[PDB]
Amino acid sequence: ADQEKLFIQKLRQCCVLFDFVSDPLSDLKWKEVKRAALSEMVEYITHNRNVITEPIYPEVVHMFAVNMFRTLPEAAWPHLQLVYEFFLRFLESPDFQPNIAKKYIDQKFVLQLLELFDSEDPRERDFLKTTLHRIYGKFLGLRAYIRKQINNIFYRFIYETEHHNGIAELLEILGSIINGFALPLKEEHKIFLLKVLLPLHKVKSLSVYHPQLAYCVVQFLEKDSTLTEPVVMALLKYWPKTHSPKEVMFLNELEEILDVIEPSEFVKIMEPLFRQLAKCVSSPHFQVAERALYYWNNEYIMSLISDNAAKILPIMFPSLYRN
C-alpha cells in the first residue's frame, strides 16, 4: 500500500547491523540514517492514525528482536533507545491489536525480553520495565508464563545465588500486577508472597530493591489482610539481629505496613512488633532510634496503640508501666 511498503522497508532497513572499522565517515553516515529512520517511524506511528496494519506486526517484532535480543557484556545507546521508544509507541497505539500481535509476541520473545532485564544500564532496564508491563497487560495468554518466568528469576538470585540487576524493575511490574488482583486471592499468589517475596528480605543486596519490595508486600496486605501475621513475623524474623543502618528500611517497610493494617490483625502481632520497636528505640545507632521514634507521629498507629495501650505501653516503657 505504497506507504505500508515504505514503512516495512524502513523497518527491515533497521535490521541491518553494520560496522565500518576502516571508515569512520561511512560508519557515522550509516548510524545517522538508521537513527533518522527510527525517528521518522517513531513520529509516524505516534501521531498518525490507522497506520499499524496486519503486515506491519511481524516487521516491527522482528526489527526489535534483531536489534535488542543481543548478548550483554551500551555505547551505541541512542540507537537502542529509539528501538525501545518505537516498540513502546507500537504497543501503546490505539490501533494496536493484541489478537494479531500475539502470533509474533510469544513466550520465546518474552523470555528473551526478560533476559535483558539483567542489563547494567538503568535506562535500558527502565524501558524493559515499561515494555514488559505493557506486554503483560495487553496479552492475557502470556500473563501466566510471565508470572512463572519472573518467579523463576526470583527463585534464583535468592537461593541459586544467581545475582540479578533487574530485581527492582521486576518487583515494580509485580506491584502493578498485585494491585489488580481478583477479590479472593488465588492460592498461587499467596504461595508466591510467602515463599518468594518475604525471603527476598534476607538477601544482602536488599538495599537496591527494598522500596519496590515493600510496596509489593503492602499491596498484598491491602488485598487480603489475613496475610498480615505471617508477613510481619517473617519481617521480624528477617530483621537484622545486628544493629545496623539496614534497620531503617525494615522500619520504613513496617510503618508502611501499619498504615494499611487492620486492627484485628494488629492485635495478632502488636506484642512481638513493639518488642522489636522498643529495641530500635534503645539502639546505639541514632538513625535507627530516630526512625523508630518517628512512629509516634503516625496518627493511625497512635489509634492502634491507644486502643491497646494496656499491653503495648508496658513494652515500650517497662519502667513506667506494667501488666
Binding site: 515499561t130 508491563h133 497487560g137 489488580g180
Partner: peptide, 8 residues
Amino acid sequence: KLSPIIED
C-alpha cells in the same frame, strides 16, 4: 508509577 493491571 505503573498503572494497575486487572486480573482475569
